[PDB]
């Protein structure tokens, strides 16, 4: 009740502290794994003869 009308008006607005990158990040592209992974996986199955 004792909050004056000036105090009521002087209430600040809430501003976000996160920057542009945090709030609205650019779309994160998804890419396939490099072919070296398949190459090394198929090389893993290879075994010596001695």
């Amino acid at each position: 009740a004792e909050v004056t009308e000036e105090e009521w008006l002087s209430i600040p607005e809430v501003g976000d502290a996160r920057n542009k990158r945090q709030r609205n990040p650019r779309y994160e592209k998804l890419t396939p794994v490099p072919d070296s992974f398949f190459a090394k996986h198929l090389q893993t199955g290879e075994n010596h003869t001695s």
Binding site: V14, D16, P34, L42
Partner: protein, 376 residues
Amino acid sequence: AKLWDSKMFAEIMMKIEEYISKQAKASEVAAPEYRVIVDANNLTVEIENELNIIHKFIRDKYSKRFPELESLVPNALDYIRTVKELGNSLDKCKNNENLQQILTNATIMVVSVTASTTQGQQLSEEELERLEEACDMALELNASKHRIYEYVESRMSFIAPNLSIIIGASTAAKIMGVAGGLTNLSKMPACNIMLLGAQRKTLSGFSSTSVLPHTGYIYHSDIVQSLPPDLRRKAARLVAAKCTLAARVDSFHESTEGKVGYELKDEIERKFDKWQEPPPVKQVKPLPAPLDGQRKKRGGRRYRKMKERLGLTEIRKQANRMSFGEIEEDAYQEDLGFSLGHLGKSGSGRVRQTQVNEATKARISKTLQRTLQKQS
């Protein structure tokens, strides 16, 4: 032979000039007072250059007993107090004695642990008596230096009226004493002034960030320490720059009222408030409306390269094919269902294995490459 002989002359001169300082203090509350301040501020340099010599002598002498304490305790005064407290008897319950005031708890346990395996012989009685004599002389010199700093701090409203306004008389006294004079302070860049009084504190199993490095008296001043820790570096830099400006003004005895000092302090406060300013209102970005209209996209070299990168590769085209009725064997324990498909398996139709496409090779970002180049 020389340091001991010069110690008596240094003590006599310090006593005479301290009597002069006491007389000046009594008179204040043709021998002007500015010459007294100059003499005291040269006394500070003389006391520092005698105290470091005494510390080196003690370090050389005490190294026979506990050689490792020098690395654990880099500070000269702390080294002297520690070697005084421990003395010849390292394991004499001194750990829970006044050491807690001299040293931090972590470095106390570090020095106790190191003393557990000192591998250093005891010192002779003459070596002892010399060590306590040197420690007492160093403590007396430190007390005299404290008295001189107190006197100079009491008179900072005249010698450096502008610089007093920014960081206060105590920090002003410390920086003026460690710089060697107001004239020496002025003929010094702001970057060096910010590091005045900094100590290479040892980090005991901690990151260098925890033990604040490159921080001096200005970093621990009242105004700089009043900011949140994430802004204290910028605060220290700005306050050091403004203090350098004030010292340059003060060394020419201009703006004796403090108008330059008040303006610089107001600027510092405004910048601090700007750093503490709440973030502004930021609009929420709505989700883009779904669209079904045709969109024309250009081709060319860039499009060709993106098509080559994202495009399906023979190694991946072949790994997507799974034979019908050819029950393969599990090749990965940690993830079942995973298979190479037609890669290196019968029914693929290819005698030779597919080569690795170099266009799919892993590469790092341009900004990341710049950071790596900078790290080199």
